[PDB]
Symmetry: D2
């Protein structure tokens, strides 16, 4: 395992971040063992994306097995950010601080409100948690452009964004600009469904025809080469998956794979212009006034 600085927090994070999300088949000791396995593969960054009592119990017990400062703990808070408030923060206190037995969270990762501001009572509660050292930073998850007025908020220290080997320059520019402005960036969706379909049929078929590599491992290896990502979020629900993903961190992508990734970006298909409808255009032109 390799380790990167998390933005300007001064905390080193493993190249992979393990997301823990509700799975009703899992009981508490499964969650504890999942985290134990991640720790044994050098993963110190965890993202809690669920709040079932068994998840909190097992995860909290595993986190307690190492000294707190060795871990980076993010709570993922979904829902319409514009509708968050004091009841949200009460729930966060029950789940994150009682459920996981934490004194502080490193990062609260919320949805992009698509606004320059947060609701007042929620932001005031966040400020309270920050001054109490119970919350060390706020992050914004987005699949588009986050309002710079929101990123300028003193609470906001991190962003989360998708990035994969078929991302274009808009997505790449978002992560690189955020990193150059000293935000920590968490990469998401290194292996999205659309790319799994492309890997089977078409220009990306090399992803399933490269000796010694799976398509998923190639997509992870590529995201791991991107300078602007502090860490790449992965989800794994058994030991074998954690071990394989962590193994990718120490491998080198073949240069021929890199060239095929670049080759594959080309796009040719164009459209002939669509039909004229002068009758329709004329009726619209002659609207009543």
């Amino acid at each position: 395992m390799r380790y990167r600085p998390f933005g300007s927090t001064g905390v080193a994070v493993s190249a992979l971040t393990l997301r823990l999300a509700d799975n009703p088949r899992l009981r508490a000791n499964d969650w504890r063992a999942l985290v134990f396995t991640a720790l044994e593969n050098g993963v110190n960054s965890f993202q809690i994306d669920g709040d079932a009592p068994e998840l909190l119990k097992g995860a909290g017990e595993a986190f307690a097995s190492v000294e707190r400062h060795l871990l980076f703990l993010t709570w993922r808070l979904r829902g319409d950010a514009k509708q968050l408030g004091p009841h949200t923060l009460d729930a966060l206190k029950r789940s994150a601080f009682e459920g996981l037995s934490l004194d502080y969270l490193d990062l609260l990762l919320i949805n992009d409100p698509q606004s320059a501001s947060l609701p007042m009572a929620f932001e005031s509660g966040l400020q309270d948690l920050q001054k109490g050292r119970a919350l060390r930073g706020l992050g914004v998850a987005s699949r588009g452009d986050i309002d710079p007025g929101l990123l300028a908020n003193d609470l906001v220290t991190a962003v989360s964004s998708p990035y994969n080997l078929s991302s274009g320059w808009a997505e790449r520019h978002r992560i690189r600009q955020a990193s150059q402005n000293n935000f920590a960036v968490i990469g998401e969706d290194f292996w999205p469904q659309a790319l799994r379909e492309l890997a089977d049929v078409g220009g990306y078929e090399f992803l399933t025809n490269t000796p010694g590599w799976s398509a998923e491992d190639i997509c992870l290896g590529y995201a791991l080469t991107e300078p602007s990502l502090a860490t790449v979020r992965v989800t794994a629900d058994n030991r074998q998956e954690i071990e394989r993903l962590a193994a990718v961190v120490e491998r080198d992508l073949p240069t021929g794979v890199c060239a095929q990734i670049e080759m594959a970006r080309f796009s040719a298909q164009e459209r002939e212009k669509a039909a004229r409808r002068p009758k329709l255009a004329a009726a619209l032109e002659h609207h009543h006034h």
Copy 2:
């Protein structure tokens, strides 16, 4: 103006769809004048993205200035789709039906719920609207991969998705696969903030240095050549912007521009691997048991 079939449900839609969104500057007469200009430039497809009374009043007057069957009217319903319920349908009746003075909507465009299903009471209410012809289709707006179980819902006839000249193959595959499966696709974000920033400095600087073309117009022309999009959503708050955008529909992109769009996709800035931290990895390995 040119017109495209909207998915498998027949209707002709202008290659541009005009998004009408809350702007506290504009009163009802300004909204009416804006829709009038749109109509006069051949636009018959409008997406209402807001519920301010002045907006509903002016847009509804303007829509009534032509025969209803010439227009394709989409209501954009934001917010967490998992929290939609009967109150949502009440508010829709007041705003979209009474407020715009409509008997039916061509499309209700909701956020991706990131689930294969919608809340049951809301879905039951939508089924009621559909059986009465008050709602002709449901669309799902997403910046990721929509669950196929949701797309298989009989209500769902359309998807909306970002596409621009810096989009990669994941985004492109989503819209081509949707189209091939006979969904109507509305293109979004042809001119996102990230691309505006790239157009000023770097490999996309040609966007602001092409004789006879603005960067925005190049980005629109490119979107208009994508075969899978039924229509391209644009936001324009004055007559000049509407006229310029509609003029793009009839122009041909220079071949040197298309070549530069393809050459700009390349990306070569690839990390050196991060730090080992063997003390940290060992401490994590040696967690208590």
Copy 3:
């Protein structure tokens, strides 16, 4: 080994043509050994490009070890083709016919005279050889564009031209147009010195860093995939090199190597405009009379 049609002649040749070129350290035994190894690897096409007695002796012996009609034997005749004459025909009779113990040549491959015509006496000598059934065809070797009036000569059935994985479209167009116009095309210089230097430092370094492939074998494998070439000329001076080159005919290039070959074609270096010399230019413009 695979066998291709040699242009429109109606005869077949091995995908490789072994060139035998003067080498002062080799004796007849050594030349015979080389030809034997090539025969044992399916090569039936040989190009004699030297006239040292030991070369003619050893090669003639080896050719006499199989039925003459199973071989395609090309004599390479260098020198200014505009200076060829009766002395040339006399020397050809000593070296090619008496020296190799041949009754006929499959091809006489001369330099491009950079003209539409051949010297009269030389051409009459070639017509005499063809009427005597001692010469089946004339070929023209060039590194530029051959005069089409020369190619229209009834004697000329074949051309020889460079092609390698760093060739561009002018080179490629020449060989494809010759093949489409029913000439046999012999590929030369699949592994020129300049590419051996590129293979060591720069964008072509992958040629020496591809698992299981040597740089020379990749360059031959690429030339073997060009559709316009009837055969690829190779030079080898030891058994083991002949066996490896022949083995490439049955191998498949990795798709990642093909991608790197395409990626390597890009060139971005540009110079700034040079110095103005207004006084020098004014002096030149003010020339007398």
Copy 4:
């Protein structure tokens, strides 16, 4: 016009060199007029590539219209360089020196002998010319790789080599390496027949469809951006072509044209493997011993 250092010689040459080649359809005053037009457009570098009495008379008269030391005059000596001898020197003295009325040549440009050495008597004669200050340098023209032992000869200060926008990296490496080793490099064949054909149909069609530019001028523009070339050789036979080519030296190629040039390098077409002939292969393998 712009002027570049001619390798490490210490002298400057115009960025274009005008080649004057034998043309039976021109008379002395036509040649004089071509040289005059070149001079009036800043060209001071001329290559004489023929020896017709009318060519020598007209070109010599035009060269005498300016101070000799302002011109760079190259005599192009074709023929098999391995056959050069005393006759060649006598002919050079009669044609280049007496026929052009010159006391010295700035450069003698011979064909690549394809050897590390020149014939002794010829080389001794060149040494006599140099000691007499009648010859300032020897250049070697090649379409392949010149033996480094020949380039190391103290006489040889320049090379001439093809370079166009469809050239590959082997050609480009040759010229950049020569320039880095302090040779003057003359660029040849900026506009070869093969490229004229590609410009008419195919991926290079943009060469004849670019507003404001001819195909020829784009090809010359690209060659003028190559850093390793001291000058680009052109052959023009009318006033207006000379003026347009000189004008290219002061123009900037559009970035869209540059992108298309890089686009066009791609080559996709491949060959399936040819026929097996197991009986022929077996017959060759069982050659007699």
